Design a binder for this molecule. Structure first.
Ligand SMILES: *[C@@H]1O[C@H](CO)[C@@H](O[C@@H]2O[C@H](CO)[C@@H](O[C@@H]3O[C@H](CO)[C@@H](O)[C@H](O[C@@H]4O[C@H](CO)[C@@H](O)[C@H](O)[C@@H]4O)[C@@H]3O)[C@H](O)[C@H]2NC(C)=O)[C@H](O)[C@H]1NC(C)=O
Ligand SMILES: *[C@@H]1O[C@H](CO)[C@@H](O[C@@H]2O[C@H](CO)[C@@H](O[C@H]3O[C@H](CO)[C@@H](O)[C@H](O)[C@@H]3O)[C@H](O)[C@H]2NC(C)=O)[C@H](O)[C@H]1NC(C)=O
Ligand SMILES: *[C@@H]1O[C@H](CO)[C@@H](O[C@@H]2O[C@H](CO)[C@@H](O)[C@H](O)[C@H]2NC(C)=O)[C@H](O)[C@H]1NC(C)=O
Ligand SMILES: *[C@@H]1O[C@H](CO)[C@@H](O[C@@H]2O[C@H](CO)[C@@H](O)[C@H](O)[C@H]2NC(C)=O)[C@H](O)[C@H]1NC(C)=O
Ligand SMILES: *C/C=C(C)/C=C/C=C(C)/C=C/C1=C(C)CCCC1(C)C
Ligand SMILES: *C/C=C(C)/C=C/C=C(C)/C=C/C1=C(C)CCCC1(C)C
Ligand SMILES: CCCCCCCS[C@@H]1O[C@H](CO)[C@@H](O)[C@H](O)[C@H]1O
Ligand SMILES: CCCCCCCS[C@@H]1O[C@H](CO)[C@@H](O)[C@H](O)[C@H]1O
Ligand SMILES: CCCCCCCS[C@@H]1O[C@H](CO)[C@@H](O)[C@H](O)[C@H]1O
Ligand SMILES: CCCCCCCS[C@@H]1O[C@H](CO)[C@@H](O)[C@H](O)[C@H]1O
Ligand SMILES: CCCCCCCCCCCCCCCC(=O)O
Ligand SMILES: CCCCCCCCCCCCCCCC(=O)O
Ligand SMILES: [Hg+2]
Ligand SMILES: [Hg+2]
Ligand SMILES: [Hg+2]
Ligand SMILES: [Hg+2]
Ligand SMILES: [Hg+2]
Ligand SMILES: [Hg+2]
Ligand SMILES: [Zn+2]
Ligand SMILES: [Zn+2]
Ligand SMILES: [Zn+2]
Ligand SMILES: [Zn+2]
Ligand SMILES: [Zn+2]
Ligand SMILES: [Zn+2]
Ligand SMILES: [Zn+2]
Lengths: 348, 348
């Protein structure tokens, strides 16, 4: 056999030399050099050191500024929370696991590890579909007098947690399951064994269709809509109204956010599908370790794209950070927002 | 003319089309795509969000743990402090600048950007010499009963600041000057023009001989000394006394720190020197942007070598992160201490 299937695992290493051992009971240094695990450990550490501040700061700014209440300001507040669950929820276990060369906390740690990374990526994926819509409803404007209230935003946010949970929670209760992958310091869904006892083969198809092919289609198709309408071609102050102009920005961003997602997940999803379609074949520990760990940057790139592609949030952040105010920068030239300064309601 | 010189700059772009404008008065988007500036801006944001907690935490642990006071401990607090300046003193302007496409704070921002990036890198090169020495004084011990006390440590620290300032400061008071480079989002020493009005050519030979070629000779030399004595080969607990084997671990860190530094500056120093001996030739903005923005990682790679290459520091840091105690792991094995917990001195 090319690997070593266990009742709880599947190490991508032959046990012909009987050197293989349950990744819930002993270091896996026979899969790779111990320094490479240190790498993972070092890496997971820097990610937690970056992901905590960036996602907490994002969260703190959003809340403190009473006007940052657009559908977009919601979705990204959502992403910051889900990213903080990633950091504290599973990243803590993945660094702890890399530090020991195996899942000391056994399957429980593997579930934390798997669940939160899943929950996080999936909340990002579904938040993209909500943006695709909101983006569409404003650009191709289907109604003749409609506008997304905060309520809607809270609806979209509630929707992403039902969809993400619909995909992330099943494996904890008998449908499919989380299993260690690559150097066995991370955990994902089961694409490795057909384990009929927990119905793995069906869940994997349920996840690649309901939580992937489909949301991607929506998102992609919706883009093909905002092709003839709002284009990437974004000029200066006013495009047909400084309003419309600044509309071209959110969409440009919502489009970058999509490219960042794919880059981050296509490789993982790709190897994952392969393995599903080539179970038991001869792949090694490094095969899935690279995309599996690279994809964890998903807990941080969102806020970065946000602060670099949103003059208003960046300013609100600079204002926040600068303790007092003085948003120096160039401001947004347009609306502003905060707590006691110029959060002065200015509708109609 | 291949580039466009101003009395204040030098844009590595021809003004044949008349599209060039002061990197002090308007965006340089005609030098490169606007997304590429957003790219540089994302890079710096991360550098600021990682370099801050990592150099601050370093600083805080050292000060907090009463035993971390060896020369090494002294040099790296320094670095942690020189790194916090780069980040706040300069990286902040380099982010804001990329966020706008040019130096909005004119030459003052340029000075901020360049001075600190210079102050920071030079302190690093000088501290590398102080280590080369302390290293040779312990491995080739030219003395009889001489010990490198904390006093010799505060000396070698002050010394690095005298050298670093000797280079970082002149350009601010009339000898040479800081000028934007590459996409004009970073500032450096004037390798571009002769501007006799400020003696550029001289300062540049001063900096490549005193603050580069010399220290590297020393460091490389002392490395030759400890070639026959302590080398890379370091066995388990002891090699002629665990004291003699625990030092061979500080030496390898010092070597790695030197490698890390070279990988960070030779490319820059090289481009920088290439341009000084070929001023006016045909190079573009990308030419110096890469090695220039790549070197800014100097504000964070040091603390990482240290955590990864110094058990003592490592274990004593996690003790700080576990709020209270909870040494877990396998303690420092040798000394351990902190602010009060295991701070108990057990010397002679
Ligand atoms: C590359 O070649 C270009 C074409 O030959 C050449 O173009 C000249 O560019 C200058 C500025 O870069 C132009 O002069 C400006 O004209 C505007 C009027 O529209 C003025 O407002 C501006 O000065 C102002 O001064 C105020 C007081 O200090 C200040 O508040 C303002 O902000 C602003 O500084 C300039 O007088 C000039 O018209 C252009 N001539 C041509 C032929 O178009 C570029 O300068 C040249 N670029 C290089 C060499 O870097
Ligand atoms: C790869 O082949 C190895 C040899 O067949 C095999 O080693 C076996 O590992 C098990 C661990 O479960 C040992 O079983 C021990 O189980 C408990 C330990 O708490 C106790 O009842 C006994 O100590 C018992 O020995 C086997 O003894 C051991 N057999 C050997 C060394 O020949 C690996 O498990 C195989 N890799 C896999 C499938 O994980
Ligand atoms: C072990 O792995 C090898 C290589 O991945 C498998 O061999 C392949 O077998 C399939 C048929 O299932 C062929 O289409 C390929 O051409 C084979 N490739 C090679 C390298 O021979 C093998 O099937 C695996 N063994 C099992 C079933 O555990
Ligand atoms: C503009 O840039 C070109 C490219 O470097 C310069 O041309 C070089 O000139 C040197 C000395 O005159 C020759 O040895 C090289 O062979 C030339 N490079 C080539 C092959 O083009 C040119 O001198 C520069 N012009 C200015 C403003 O000085
Ligand atoms: C380190 C953590 C890892 C590798 C997380 C595992 C996450 C999953 C099994 C998630 C699956 C998918 C997505 C989040 C995005 C779309 C594609 C999937 C179905 C492969
Ligand atoms: C982004 C910041 C930059 C490009 C910093 C500029 C720094 C200098 C002018 C520093 C010069 C040098 C060193 C610190 C190391 C040795 C080689 C030099 C002389 C090129
Ligand atoms: C960006 C999507 C990534 C898609 C994943 C590609 C799986 S590709 C697969 O990898 C195996 C490694 O053991 C090779 O042995 C095999 O020949 C190759 O076809
Ligand atoms: C961290 C992700 C940000 C870097 C990726 C570049 C995306 S794109 C970039 O965005 C700028 C800000 O709105 C625009 O002004 C510019 O025209 C556009 O090309
Ligand atoms: C260690 C990195 C040192 C890099 C120094 C080599 C510079 S190389 C130099 O670059 C010019 C501008 O791009 C070209 O026009 C020229 O043909 C090329 O030889
Ligand atoms: C929480 C901060 C993360 C920094 C990682 C510190 C790894 S520390 C490492 O751990 C091993 C087993 O646990 C011990 O045997 C060893 O002595 C200790 O130095
Ligand atoms: C089209 C691209 C959008 C991409 C954006 C950038 C946001 C990036 C952050 C990635 C996390 C990098 C972490 C370093 C840890 C070593
Ligand atoms: C969009 C930008 C991607 C940017 C990425 C990464 C920048 C950060 C990491 C610095 C850690 C370097 C490690 C030192 C190893 C010695
Ligand atoms: Hg869309
Ligand atoms: Hg990513
Ligand atoms: Hg604002
Ligand atoms: Hg040395
Ligand atoms: Hg470096
Ligand atoms: Hg300690
Ligand atoms: Zn079973
Ligand atoms: Zn889902
Ligand atoms: Zn199957
Ligand atoms: Zn601004
Ligand atoms: Zn002048
Ligand atoms: Zn110096
Ligand atoms: Zn010259």
């Amino acid at each position: 056999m090319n690997g070593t299937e266990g009742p709880n695992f599947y190490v991508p290493f032959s046990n012909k030399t009987g050197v293989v051992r349950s990744p819930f009971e002993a270091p896996q240094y026979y899969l790779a050099e111990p320094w490479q695990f240190s790498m993972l450990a070092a890496y997971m550490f820097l990610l937690i050191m970056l992901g905590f501040p960036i996602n907490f700061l994002t969260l703190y700014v959003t809340v403190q500024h009473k006007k940052l209440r657009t559908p977009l300001n919601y979705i990204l507040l959502n992403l910051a929370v889900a990213d903080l669950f990633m950091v504290f929820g599973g990243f803590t276990t993945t660094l702890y696991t890399s530090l020991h060369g195996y899942f000391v906390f056994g399957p429980t740690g593997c579930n934390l590890e798997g669940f939160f990374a899943t929950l996080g990526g999936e909340i990002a994926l579904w938040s993209l579909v909500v943006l695709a819509i909101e983006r569409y409803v404003v650009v191709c404007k289907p109604m003749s007098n409609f506008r997304f209230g905060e309520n809607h935003a809270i609806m979209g946010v509630a929707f992403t947690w039902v969809m993400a949970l619909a995909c992330a929670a099943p494996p904890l209760v008998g449908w499919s399951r989380y299993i260690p992958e690559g150097m066995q310091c991370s955990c994902g869904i089961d694409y490795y064994t057909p384990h009929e006892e927990t119905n793995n083969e069906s869940f994997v198809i349920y996840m690649f269709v309901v939580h992937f092919i489909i949301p991607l289609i929506v998102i992609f198709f919706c883009y093909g809509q905002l092709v003839f309408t709002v284009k990437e071609a974004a000029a200066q102050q006013q495009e047909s109204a400084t309003t419309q102009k600044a509309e071209k920005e959110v969409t440009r961003m919502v489009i970058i956010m999509v490219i960042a997602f794919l880059i981050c997940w296509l490789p993982y999803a790709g190897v994952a599908f392969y393995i599903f379609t080539h179970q038991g074949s001869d792949f090694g520990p490094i095969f899935m370790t690279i995309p599996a760990f690279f994809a964890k940057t998903s807990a941080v790139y969102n806020p970065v794209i946000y602060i670099m592609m949103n003059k208003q949030f960046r300013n609100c952040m600079v204002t926040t950070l600068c303790c007092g105010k003085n948003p120096l920068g160039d401001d947004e030239a347009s609306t502003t927002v905060s707590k006691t300064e110029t959060s002065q309601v200015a509708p109609a």
